[PDB]
Structure formats: structure tokens, C-alpha cells
């Protein structure tokens, strides 16, 4: 399967681990064991913070996943114009009759 | 699967193993396993006291192992 | 030949999930996998020894799931068939 | 899988990691594995207490690792498509 | 003499093939400088025979 | 100026501005929607794919997505920024004739020759509702509220249906023949309607009687669906006719501007959302931007 997991790719995530710690950052790479790779990571042990960088977690260590934010980031047809004119028709009445 | 680990360079050399329950052992590396089960000879405990008891030939389980060191370069 | 296949039918309903961690999680199920990894929509999860916090897109590492408390309206006899 | 290849690519650089033990180890990485074994040198351990030490050579078991911490240039590295019948990612000229 | 034009024609002298622009390739170019600058990943050699 | 731009190969039908007032779209029998600028009056994308002829465009109220109503059951959807396909809303078993859109660009209504009205979501690719009458339907309009949908058929009976009830609440009366285009004001308070009796009548939305029957804009053998519009103020009414003339009314029951210019039958007249301009289209393959100083 893993169809849902590809959809998460390149989003800022909030990942709770078995220790209780919570890592945060974008998701670059993903596995069948749920090994996650995360970019520009920050733990929140708890009024606390730390800067790590690139972090590769195991599957054993991970508990839950949750998105913090969204993913980060016919030329010219034939037609031609002209000016005015607005000719008057001598005849009245509809197009087909006469 | 079953990646036979790179323990060829440790064979017939002294070691300083660590295992689960904060218990550790010295020994000559005789043989290794797929699952990292180990064969140690001239096995000496390192008790929490520091009292070193000689045992002999010993087979440590793979699961338990935390790590494996070298005493002398 | 698995009871897991029955959980793939379960999609859409709300459930309060308990984990080995000891948390509790009210939220609607979107998808369920063969390896138990469930994804949830509009979630209100509460941690052991903290206040409840609402999350939008929760997903769980199946390994950790103790039990689903299913809704009372769901017919079991119909779902247990292939 | 890509989460393993990234590891193999940080061989040579200096790595930080965390084990179930509770302690963190820092040193040059020499060899890794698909299991997540490791082989490092000049390690500077720091446990829960704060106790520093030195370990010349080390082997590990992956099962015992919680998570790694890897150098910054390893985010521009290529992440390949892999295939159904291949172990290592690598780039792929052929069919698919 | 006659051969010499009089109004010189523009002439782009080309010796060898070169690409107007970089050709796009799997690994990103910064990562190539990363390796080249950062580490001992780099090798060099001569292919001969 | 006036600006009589050429471009299409065959009979053009529908031409509309964005809600903003910065573009045209146009497209008829060509199987080609041609986008335009307003203020250097040049073409843009050739939206290509529809395998039936177009019968109705409508900009999404985001001013990005466009919706068609081909003669081969499809209702297409187009990214006007890029110009790629999004979907093929496959449903009807016949020729679609009209489209309508809401504030919320999400809901669409179409009208077949299967005698079936159908409401569409821009997320499902299927019908939300299916209202089967009896005689092939032709014109539809949805209110600003996102509640009342008006249907125009062959009986001369503009029926009114809500999205909650789905009951024949009311039926407009006094129109002897055929409806070619409904049109709700920018209030949500009154319709316009072209019948084949040439009575370009206004109706009420809430008591529900007539207001002013306008008379002087002929349909004949052609059997094209002619259009009507409300001006941005809702002062003027702009009805085209098969007499090659754009009969603009005063909404008080007085013909003010009657400007010719086309050499063939006229189809869908429009108005710009702010500045006084008139889009007028016609089988002829031509289009004008009639102004008032």
C-alpha cells in the first residue's frame, strides 16, 4: 500500500516518539519500516528546544504522525482584433426568411 | 536479510562488550553469527563492584548485545 | 485469512483508540492498512498526564495500538464475511 | 529503501546518535549496514549523567538505535525511485 | 582578389560540441559541489590503454 | 472604439467576461475556446479537447477555472492560467445546452436533451442530483444564494426548484413558447428570459408575477439559443436577436440603443462588470465591444 504515506512527503510534521519527545520538520524520505528522514529538526522535551539538523528515526521509536503545515514551495491563438465599423442593413426581418 | 556482519576484523582479538542490564564482558573473539550471537574465550566479568571473575569459553546472545569495543588499537 | 482484512471495511466511523503508550484518541478513520497503520481525520487526542489537544491529520504506527472501541451501530456479522 | 542509503552516504563524516540505553555517541563513521549496525572511531559518549568518555572502536546493533543525526549537505543527496526487484536504490537507465 | 567578400559574413567558428545550457541529471548540482568541497568522497584518475 | 475581432472558423456561440472584467472567453462550433484580453485585445490559449461543439462557457468565480458544455455530453474544465484539462464530467446521454455556477465555483448545473437537469460538484466527477422532467430542457439559472435553480423548457414554463426540498414550488406563466436563456440579476431578485414569441420578459423571484414584457427582438427558423443579460447596475437589459441587431432596453420598458453591425444572427449578448461595454456574439465568427462614452 503506502499510498497515503507518499501524500505526506515534503510537509512539516509533528512526530511523537515512544520516549515522549516530539520531533518537527519536513519529510524527505520514508520506508516500509516507517523509518522517517526529517529536515531541519527540533525536539521539544517537556519550555525547551534543541537544533539537530538531519535526523533519521527508526520504526521502533515512532508512535504517531501529524501534519503541522502544508507542503512548501497555449501561447497565442489565431484570433486578431480590428477597429470599428458598424454597417447598416437595408433589409429588416430575420436571417432565413426574406 | 541476514547480512552477515563485518566482524572478521575482530576475530582472535580482545574485546570489551556491553550487554543488557548494564553488564559487560572481556574476551577473545572466536566466532559470530547472522543474528550477532558471539563466542568468547577467556571470559572475565566486570561486576558493578569491579570484582573480576574468570569464567572461560562463553556464548553471548545476539539480541542482548548493545555494542562491542577494542581495548588496544 | 486475517482479522486485519475486517478493519479495512471499518473506514469512516469514529473510534476512541488506546495505545501501549497510554493515550486516548477520538477521531474519524480514513484508511487502514494490512500492517495496522491507520490514518485519522478531525482528531482530538489526549496524552497520558496532559491536556487534550485537537489535531487534523493524525496517523499511528500500528505496532502501538492496543484496541479500538468501535461504535455501537456497526453490524459485525456482515463485516466478518469476505 | 532510502532511509538506509542516506546512512551509508554519511560514512566518513562525523555522526551523532541516540540509543535505547539513553546515551548519545559522536564520531567518524566507518561502516554501516542494512540492519543499522555501525562502526565508528574516536567516539565521545555522553550519557544521562553528562559523563564523558572515549572509545577507540565500536560496533553496535541497529535494534538498539533510536535515531541518528547527520551532516547538513546530506539533504541535497539524490533520492531515487528504486524498483520492485532491487535492493539498493541507485540510478536506473533500463526499463524500470 | 574576388574571393574576399567585401561585406564580411558573420561566421561562428566552432571546433567542438558544447551544450548551450546544462543538461539536467538526476543528482542536483549543489550536491556535486558539496562532495567536491566538503569531503574525501572525491577521487580522481586516468583511464588508459 | 468598437473592436470587431475575428478568430473563429465557424459559428461562434458564447462569449463572456471574467467576473473581474479583464478577459473574454469565446467558443462555438470550432471546438475551441479562445481567451482574450480586454485592455492589448489579443488572443491567448486555444483550449483544445472538447469533441462536441461548445454551447456554454462560465468562468469560475476565482477567475482561473473555465467550464464548458459540449454537444457530446461532456462538461470539461480548464485551468485558464496554464491551459490544461482537469476533468470530464461524464453524465448526460445527450446534448447539453446550458450551464450555471455559484459563489461557493464548486457547484454547477447542466441541462440536456434527455430532459434531465443535473447538479454537479467540482470534486466528485458525478451527479449530486438528477431532476427528470419530460420534454428536452434548454436554459437554466442558479441564484446568488445557492438555493433556487430556475429551469426553462419547451412548454414556456419556467419552473423553480430548491436544493433542500426538490419540489415544483412555482411555475412562471404567460410565456407561450420556448426559452433560450434565463438570467438572474446581481440582486437575486428578478429573471430575464427570451421566448420564441419574441417577448423578452422579466419575472419576480420571491409573490412571483411578471414585471415588464419587452417586445421587439425576433427569433425565426435558425433555432439558435439567443441570450439576455443584466447590466452591472441592473438598469439596462441586453437582448440579441436573429435580426442582426442588439436590442438594449431601458428596463423601464424603453428601447434606447439598437445597434446593428453583425451580418448574421446574434446569440449571446453580455455586459462588462463595471465600465459600460457590450460583448455581442453571432454566427458570423465575429464579436463587438460596443461602448458608451
Handedness of CA F32, F153, F99, F248 (dihedral sign): positive
Closest-CA residue to D36 (of D14, D76, D8): D8
Question: How many structural domains does chain C have?
Answer: 1
Contact call for A and C: 3+ CB–CB distances under 8 Å: yes
Number of domains in chain D: 1
B39 forms bridges with which residues in the sheet? B31, B59
C-alpha distances in angstroms, F239 versus F90, F197, F216, F234? 32, 14, 10, 14
Q: Is B65 within 8 Å of D57 when comparing Cβ atoms?
A: no
Query: In the numeric block, which cell numbers belong to residue D66?
Result: 533510536
Exposed (0-12), middle (13-18) or buried (19+): which is F22, by Cβ within 10 Å?
middle
Binary contact (C55, A65; C-beta < 8 A) = no
Domain holding B21, by residue range, is 1-73
Please give the method by which this entry was determined: cryo-EM
Which has the closest alpha carbon to A18: A47, A74, A76, A61?
Answer: A61
Q: What is the DSSP letter of D75?
A: G
* CATH number for position D67: 2.30.30.100
DSSP calls for F70-134: -SSS--EEEETTT--EEEE----SS---EEEE-----EEEEE-SSSEEEEEETTTSSEEEEEE-S
Q: Which residues pair with F281 in a beta bridge?
A: F287
Question: Which residues in chain A are contacts of F34 at CB distance < 8 A?
Answer: 77-79
What are the residue ranges spanned by the domains of chain F?
1-293
Which residues in chain A touch residue D68, judged by CB atoms under 8 angstroms apart? 55-56
- N- to C-terminal Cα separation, chain A: 70
Architecture in CATH of F1-293 = 7 Propeller (2.130)
d(CA F189, CA F208): 10
Phi, psi (degrees; rounded to nearest 5) at B18: -130, 145
Count CB-CB contacts under 10 A for residue D79.
16
The count of other CB atoms within 10 Å of the CB of residue A7 is 12
DSSP D77: S
Q: Could you give the number of structural domains in chain B?
A: 1
Dihedral sign, Cα of residue D89, residue D93, residue D94, residue D95: positive
Structural domain span for residue D47: 1-96
Range of the domain at C13: 1-82
Q: What is the resolution of this structure in A?
A: 3.6
Q: Is the pair B, C in contact (3+ CB pairs within 8 Å)? A: no
Joined grid coordinates for residue F223: 433555432
Domain of residue C30, CATH code: 2.30.30.100
E49 is in an annotated binding site: yes
How wide is the angle at C-alpha F248 spanned by C-alphas F236 and A98, nearest 5°? 160
DSSP of F1-52: ----EE--SS---EEEE-SSSSEEEEESTTSEEEEEE-----EEEEEE--SS
Record the cell numbers describing residue D73, joined without a space. Answer: 549537505
B20 in reach of chain D (CB within 8 A): no
Residues of chain D with C-beta less than 8 angstroms from the C-beta of E27: 77-78
Q: How far is A64 from chain D (nearest CA, A)?
A: 15
Q: Is the Cβ pair A74, F219 closer than 8 Å? A: no
Contact by Cβ (8 Å): B70, D57 = yes
Instruction: Tell me if F291 sits within 8 A of F8, measured CB to CB.
Output: no
Subunits close to D (at least 3 CB pairs below 8 A): A, B, E
Please check whether residue D52 is in contact with residue D45, taking contact to mean a CB–CB distance below 8 angstroms. yes
CATH number of the domain residue B28 falls in: 2.30.30.100
E31 vs D: CB within 8 A = yes
Give the burial string for B20-36 (b: 16+ CB within 10 Å, else e): eeeebbbbbbeebeeeb
8-state DSSP, F199: B
Amino acid at each position: 500500500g503506502t499510498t497515503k504515506m507518499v501524500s505526506l512527503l515534503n510537509h512539516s510534521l509533528n512526530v511523537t516518539t515512544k520516549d515522549g519527545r516530539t520531533f518537527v520538520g519536513q519529510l524527505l524520505a520514508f520506508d516500509g519500516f516507517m523509518n522517517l528522514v526529517l529536515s531541519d529538526c527540533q525536539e521539544y522535551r517537556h519550555e525547551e528546544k534543541r537544533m539537530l539538523g538531519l535526523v533519521i528515526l527508526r520504526g521502533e521509536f515512532i508512535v504517531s504522525l501529524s501534519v503541522q503545515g502544508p507542503p512548501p514551495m497555449l501561447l497565442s491563438g489565431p484570433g486578431v482584433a480590428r477597429p470599428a465599423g458598424r454597417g447598416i442593413p437595408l433589409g429588416q426581418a430575420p436571417v432565413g426568411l426574406a | 536479510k541476514a547480512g552477515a556482519p563485518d566482524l572478521k576484523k575482530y576475530l582472535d582479538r580482545q574485546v570489551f562488550v556491553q550487554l543488557n542490564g548494564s553488564r559487560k564482558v572481556y574476551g577473545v573473539l572466536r566466532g559470530y553469527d547472522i543474528f550477532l550471537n558471539i563466542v568468547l574465550e577467556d571470559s572475565i566479568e566486570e561486576k558493578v563492584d569491579g570484582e573480576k571473575v574468570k569464567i572461560g569459553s562463553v556464548a553471548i546472545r545476539g539480541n542482548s548485545v548493545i555494542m562491542i569495543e577494542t581495548l588496544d588499537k | 485469512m486475517k482479522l486485519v482484512r475486517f478493519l479495512m471495511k471499518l473506514t469512516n466511523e469514529t473510534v476512541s483508540i488506546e495505545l501501549k503508550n497510554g493515550t486516548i484518541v477520538h477521531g474519524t478513520i480514513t484508511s487502514v492498512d494490512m500492517q495496522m497503520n491507520t490514518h485519522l481525520k478531525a482528531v482530538k487526542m489526549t496524552v497520558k498526564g496532559r491536556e487534550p489537544v485537537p489535531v487534523e491529520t493524525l496517523s499511528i504506527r500500528g505496532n502501538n495500538i492496543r484496541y479500538y472501541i468501535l461504535p455501537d451501530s456497526l453490524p459485525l456479522d456482515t463485516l466478518l464475511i469476505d | 529503501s532510502l532511509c538506509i542509503k542516506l546512512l551509508h552516504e554519511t560514512q566518513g563524516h562525523i555522526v551523532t546518535m541516540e540509543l535505547e540505553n539513553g546515551s548519545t555517541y559522536r564520531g567518524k563513521l566507518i561502516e554501516a549496514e542494512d540492519n543499522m549496525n555501525c562502526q565508528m572511531r574516536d567516539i565521545s559518549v555522553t550519557a544521562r549523567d553528562g559523563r564523558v568518555s572515549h572509545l577507540d572502536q565500536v560496533y553496535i546493533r541497529g535494534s538498539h538505535i533510536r535515531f541518528l543525526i547527520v551532516p547538513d549537505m546530506l539533504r541535497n543527496a539524490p533520492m531515487f525511485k528504486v524498483g520492485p526487484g532491487r535492493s539498493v536504490p541507485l540510478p536506473t537507465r533500463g526499463r524500470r | 582578389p574576388l574571393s574576399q567578400p567585401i561585406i564580411e559574413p558573420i561566421r561562428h567558428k566552432r571546433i567542438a560540441i558544447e551544450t548551450t545550457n546544462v543538461p539536467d541529471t538526476v543528482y542536483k548540482k549543489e550536491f556535486l559541489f558539496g562532495l567536491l568541497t566538503g569531503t574525501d568522497d572525491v577521487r580522481s584518475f586516468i583511464v588508459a590503454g | 472604439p468598437n473592436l470587431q475581432m475575428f478568430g473563429h472558423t465557424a459559428e461562434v456561440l458564447v462569449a463572456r467576461f471574467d467576473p473581474s472584467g479583464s478577459y473574454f472567453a469565446s467558443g462555438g462550433m470550432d471546438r475551441q475556446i479562445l481567451l482574450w484580453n480586454v485592455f492589448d485585445v489579443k488572443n491567448y490559449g486555444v483550449l483544445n479537447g472538447c469533441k462536441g461543439a461548445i454551447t456554454d462557457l462560465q468562468w469560475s468565480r476565482d477567475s482561473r477555472v473555465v467550464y464548458c458544455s459540449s454537444s457530446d455530453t461532456h462538461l470539461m474544465s480548464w485551468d485558464a492560467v496554464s491551459g490544461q484539462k482537469i476533468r470530464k464530467h461524464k453524465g448526460h446521454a445527450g446534448v447539453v445546452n446550458a450551464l450555471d455556477v455559484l459563489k461557493v465555483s464548486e457547484l454547477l448545473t447542466s441541462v440536456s436533451d434527455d430532459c434531465t437537469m443535473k447538479v454537479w460538484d467540482s470534486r466528485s466527477k458525478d451527479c449530486i442530483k438528477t431532476i427528470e422532467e419530460k420534454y428536452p430542457l434548454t436554459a437554466v439559472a442558479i441564484a446568488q444564494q445557492g438555493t433556487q435553480v430556475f429551469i426553462g423548457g419547451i412548454d414556456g414554463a419556467i419552473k423553480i426548484w430548491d436544493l433542500r426540498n426538490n419540489h415544483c414550488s412555482h411555475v412562471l406563466k404567460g410565456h407561450k413558447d420556448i426559452i433560450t436563456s434565463l438570467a438572474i440579476s446581481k440582486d437575486g431578485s428578478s429573471l430575464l428570459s427570451n421566448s420564441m414569441d419574441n417577448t423578452v420578459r422579466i419575472f419576480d423571484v420571491k409573490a412571483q408575477r411578471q414585471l415588464q414584457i419587452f417586445e421587439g427582438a425576433i427569433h425565426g427558423q435558425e433555432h439558435n439559443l439567443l441570450g439576455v443579460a443584466w447590466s452591472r447596475n441592473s438598469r439596462f437589459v441586453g437582448a440579441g436577436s436573429s435580426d442582426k441587431n442588439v436590442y438594449v432596453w431601458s428596463a423601464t420598458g424603453d428601447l434606447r440603443y439598437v445597434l446593428p453591425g453583425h451580418e448574421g444572427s446574434v446569440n449571446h449578448v453580455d455586459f462588462h462588470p463595471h465600465q459600460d461595454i457590450i460583448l455581442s456574439c453571432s454566427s458570423d465568427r465575429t464579436i463587438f465591444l460596443g461602448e458608451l462614452n
